[PDB]
């Protein structure tokens, strides 16, 4: 049964025994399956991999508008991955997601995920609609479901202070874990993302944050979270591989 | 026999078949023996480790003021490690070195290393004195010996523009490979060193550069050279094995 804890002083969130914000960064893998058959096979393949959090990319699921189908898929994943936190993420079309839902539908989808008791966390996008996000965060918390809030820029890297402000806004909206991913156009852009990470974590955060500079040029941002302050990083099962990611994180954690 | 190449197209220096500035950053390990028996035992212990350049920290050598002893030790190392470039480095007292030498002794020590034919590269400190550096750079080049020019700040990180200007000065003085190492006092300081690395690489470098932010906090500067533009990194036998592991992953 879902249960999470969080410490503002330690800047941690504990979900299904995993302490996000302590020790080495956590590895998140994303499950993408079009049908229930695909979701089940992918979860089995993922069971063989060394990761910490399973993200289900619901926007890749064809039957997302059928509540019963979404519940069936979530249950199938939970049966295979019984001891790792499950993050429910519908990436909206606006945010690069594979299909479109209206705001109301997206909110209802996330509320249904909270109600199911099958997921430990939900992802809500920063620019969804502040009033609905606040209401949904409250609903999630009332049911012991934690909230990751996300923002993506697939084309550029905003100024450091703008990245910081977005992470602060996510905190303000009640996110348990603010998350941002930006695309570098130059090497300096990767450093901008790391600078924002350090400034946020040292000055404003009272919880864990997740940050990433995308593309091969920004890979170092997926590896250096322990020193700069990103609490988790994404790896690929089938990007940097989960095995290589753990190898490097382990090296950097050694005292 | 000593010979090196260098190109301003891909910004490389090739020494004993090793192309510095191409692909993944190169790993340098340092020999710090006090006596010839320590130097030989260390070189033998390092022979099978996976690194690219052997640095001899001559300031740790007790008989550094005995010319014959230095030449004997260089020969002993060369005999054991035959397939890797040998970098002769006397770290001066001002730069944190273990012993003190007059400017005159320091320059003569480096000239003697060049003349021996036993070393592929020498390290010269940026603030040794311009006339002395230029003459020694010229002397090394006359004998097919490459020059790494170095600068260290063991207590703080200068501003990015200051770091860039020092690297640029090393290029102007004729360094084949400018090298700088600074100490972070904050995490932002680590990023300042990386920023200087990127700016130097895009604005002024026409050769490989080596940069580092010291301490556990600055470890990412030892790992991320391929993307940010540092051509080499030091490890010890973070370990050399772990360093190669990470560099290989980042090269993929
Ligand atoms: Cl958003």
Swiss-Prot record, chain B:
Catalytic residues as annotated in Swiss-Prot or TrEMBL: 152 (proton donor/acceptor), 179 (schiff-base intermediate with substrate)
A Pfam family it matches: DHquinase_I
InterPro entries attached to this UniProt entry: 3-dehydroquinate_DH_AS (IPR018508), Aldolase_TIM (IPR013785), DHquinase_I (IPR001381), Type-I_3-dehydroquinase (IPR050146)
Enzyme class, UniProt record, top EC level: lyase
Pathway assignment: Metabolic intermediate biosynthesis; chorismate biosynthesis; chorismate from D-erythrose 4-phosphate and phosphoenolpyruvate: step 3/7
GO molecular function: 3-dehydroquinate dehydratase activity
Keywords: Amino-acid biosynthesis, Aromatic amino acid biosynthesis, Lyase, Schiff base
One biological process term in Gene Ontology: aromatic amino acid family biosynthetic process
Disulfide bonds: none
Similarity section: Belongs to the type-I 3-dehydroquinase family.
Subunit structure: Homodimer.
Protein name as catalogued: 3-dehydroquinate dehydratase
Record organism: Salmonella typhimurium (strain LT2 / SGSC1412 / ATCC 700720)
Source taxonomy: Bacteria, Pseudomonadati, Pseudomonadota, Gammaproteobacteria, Enterobacterales
């Amino acid at each position: 049964e879902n249960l999470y804890f969080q410490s503002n002083a330690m800047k941690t969130v504990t979900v299904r025994d995993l302490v996000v914000g302590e020790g080495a960064p956590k590895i998140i893998v994303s499950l993408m399956g079009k049908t229930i058959t695909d979701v089940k096979s992918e979860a089995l393949a993922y069971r063989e991999a060394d990761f910490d959090i399973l993200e289900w990319r619901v926007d890749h699921f064809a039957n997302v508008t059928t509540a019963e189908s979404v519940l069936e898929a979530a249950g199938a994943i939970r049966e295979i991955i019984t001891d790792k936190p499950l993050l429910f993420t519908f990436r909206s079309a606006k945010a690069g997601g594979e299909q479109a839902l209206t705001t109301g539908q997206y909110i209802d989808l996330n509320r249904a995920a909270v109600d199911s008791g099958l997921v430990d966390m939900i992802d809500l996008e920063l620019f969804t609609g502040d009033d609905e996000v606040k209401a949904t965060v409250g609903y999630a918390h009332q049911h012991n479901v934690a909230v990751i809030m996300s923002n993506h820029d697939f084309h550029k890297t905003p100024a450091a202070e703008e990245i910081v402000q977005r992470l602060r806004k996510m905190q303000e909206l009640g996110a348990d874990i603010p998350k941002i991913a930006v695309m570098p156009q130059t090497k300096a852009d990767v450093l901008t993302l790391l600078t924002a990470t350090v400034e946020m974590q040292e000055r404003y955060a009272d919880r864990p944050i997740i940050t990433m500079s995308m593309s091969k040029t920004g890979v170092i941002s997926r590896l250096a979270g322990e020193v700069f302050g990103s609490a988790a990083t994404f790896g690929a099962v089938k990007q940097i591989s989960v095995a290589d990611l753990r190898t490097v994180l382990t090296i950097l954690h050694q005292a």
